[PDB]
């Protein structure tokens, strides 16, 4: 009954042919909250049905109503709750980060930096491993719009996860920090800043350095060498 409920919600959203209406926007917001509630329940049926269903709803509506969507989409990032809900959410929204306009990109950056600081500290391995393909897409679409101090704070936030013991969180922090510095604003200055920080982490080498940290620093340098050319 819940599967057919989410599916009839889909077939009643799409078959309106009524766009830019306040009733349709309110119905779409309530039903979008219902979709990311449909994607939470623990079974392989309801999650996958709501997943393909929500992809149909998003791809059917990229033309007309884009900013109402990503308004509701960032509203259900900011809640910062379940792993699977935020995971599928951040999938879709990193994929749709490049459909924004450069008129509205600065508020989405100002509001996406605290949520990236929040979800950069989550100890779940799957949330990190799906944050691997999000900071490149968001910081390629939005990255040229921040100032210096915000990118310094957000780089220190991703550097503070190089100390962990899981391999996935270290490689996602590495790829995240490097892909922040790929598209930032002044690429060579941030490359020199990460070289200063990473060589400061291993200053004189005849010391104890918590070898997981050494692995993380070498993985950051493996991602950072190919762009110093």
């Amino acid at each position: 009954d819940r599967v057919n409920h989410c599916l009839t919600i889909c077939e009643n959203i799409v078959a309106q042919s009524v766009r830019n209406s306040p009733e349709f926007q309110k119905l779409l917001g309530i039903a979008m909250e219902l979709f990311l509630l449909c994607s939470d329940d623990a079974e392989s049926d309801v999650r996958m049905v709501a997943d393909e269903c929500l992809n149909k709803v998003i791809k059917a509506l990229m033309d007309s109503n884009l900013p109402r969507l990503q308004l509701e989409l960032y509203k259900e990032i900011k809640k910062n709750g379940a792993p699977r809900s935020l995971r599928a959410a951040l999938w879709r929204f990193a994929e749709l980060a490049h459909l924004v306009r450069p008129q509205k990109c600065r508020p989405y950056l100002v509001n996406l930096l605290p949520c990236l600081t929040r979800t950069s500290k989550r100890p779940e391995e799957s949330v990190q491993e799906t944050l691997a393909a999000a900071v490149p897409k968001i910081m390629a679409s939005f990255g040229n719009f921040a100032n210096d101090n915000e990118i310094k704070v957000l780089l220190k936030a991703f550097i503070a996860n190089l100390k962990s013991s899981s391999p996935t969180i270290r490689r996602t922090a590495a790829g995240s920090a490097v892909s922040i510095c790929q598209h930032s604003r002044r690429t060579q200055y941030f490359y020199s800043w990460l070289l200063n920080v990473l060589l400061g982490l291993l200053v004189p080498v005849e010391d104890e350095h918590s070898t997981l940290l050494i692995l993380g620093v070498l993985l950051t340098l493996r991602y950072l060498v190919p762009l110093l050319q």
Binding site: D63, L66, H98, L99, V100, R101, P102, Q103, C105, S141, N144, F145
Partner: protein, 336 residues
């Protein structure tokens, strides 16, 4: 509503066609929302907050001038000046903006003359790139068709701008297309602008700052080649050698110890010109042989450096075979 840029490019080309084919401007029946949105895109480009502005800007300016033939031309020149005087590098934003402006203002009363002077001064501010030199070849041809006195004065003015830039290696001549455009620029330029051989020789016999870098050598030898083709073509033999007789041009300008300290850190004009040529050959061959392939130079720099040596040996062959240069051949037979 979009963000993909090739859609925006095709929409601007479709509107350029709809304004070329003489329909009314009834696509915006009441208001002017589209063109104000285009001006807002100019604001977002000039700030720098745009992702793929490289592939959109000439179609925007072509649409603006093709609309303004019915927006003033001064507003289009002020937008191009706003991109130029405050923005990114100029091979993608400023010069593809200058192409549809200059091509659709010279080829196709007093206000036109003032805008011509402003656009010419803008091109004089951006001489350093060879695409501006192609655009200025179009300038010189469209001035030579109209009147010759303006042609001679404007050629004189850009000639004594362009020769100190060749003297101080400030001209980007790293490509073969840059030498091609530079040589066709000096061919199409007026003969009375280059007729005293003072400035063509004071910019010829020059020494670079440090020839330890590959690009400095490459720009210096490109300047020497691109002025030496003019000295072979435009001027005779006795005039050049007498002009070297009057000016104190020593043949020990680039001697062996001068080249070595730059890499580490009674005379006939026959003698000076011949030793200068053969020692430029020495620099090119000793640099092609004993330099590494990916350590010191790139792959395109290697082909253009080999290609410079090819064109300089061709210039030596044309000096030795044409029969117009007799004294230089006698000097080379007594200097080899």
């Amino acid at each position: 509503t979009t963000t993909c840029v090739q859609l925006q490019k095709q929409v601007l080309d479709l509107l350029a066609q709809l304004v070329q084919l003489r329909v009314n401007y009834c696509l915006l029946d009441s208001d002017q929302v589209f063109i104000g949105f285009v001006l807002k895109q100019f604001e977002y480009i000039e700030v720098g907050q745009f992702r793929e502005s490289e592939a959109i800007i000439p179609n925007i300016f072509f649409f603006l001038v093709l609309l303004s033939y019915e927006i003033g031309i001064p507003k289009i020149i002020q937008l191009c000046d706003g991109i130029m005087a405050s923005g990114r590098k100029a091979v993608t934003h400023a010069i593809p903006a200058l192409q549809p402006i200059v091509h659709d203002l010279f080829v196709l009363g007093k206000e036109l003359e003032t805008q011509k002077e402003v656009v010419v001064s803008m091109l004089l501010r951006l001489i350093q790139y060879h695409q501006v030199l192609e655009m200025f070849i179009l300038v010189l041809q469209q001035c030579h068709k109209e009147n010759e006195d303006k042609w001679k004065r404007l050629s004189r003015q850009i000639a004594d701008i362009i020769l100190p830039m060749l003297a101080k290696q400030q001209m980007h001549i790293d490509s073969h297309e840059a030498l091609g455009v530079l040589n066709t620029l000096f061919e199409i330029l007026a003969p009375s602008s280059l007729r005293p051989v003072d400035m063509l020789l004071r910019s010829m016999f020059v020494t670079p700052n440090t020839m330890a870098s590959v690009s400095t050598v490459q720009l210096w030898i490109s300047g020497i080649l691109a002025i030496l083709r003019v000295l072979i073509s435009q001027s005779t033999e006795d005039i050049v050698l007498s002009r070297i007789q009057e000016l104190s041009f020593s043949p020990y300008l680039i001697s062996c110890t001068v080249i070595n300290r730059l890499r580490d850190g009674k005379n006939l004009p026959e003698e000076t010109f011949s030793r200068f040529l053969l020692q430029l050959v020495g620099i090119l061959l000793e640099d092609i042989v004993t330099k590494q392939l990916k350590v010191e130079m790139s792959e395109q720099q290697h082909t253009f450096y080999c290609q410079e040596l090819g064109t300089l040996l061709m210039c030596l062959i044309h000096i030795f075979k044409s029969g117009m240069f007799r004294r230089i051949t006698a000097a080379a037979t007594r200097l080899f």
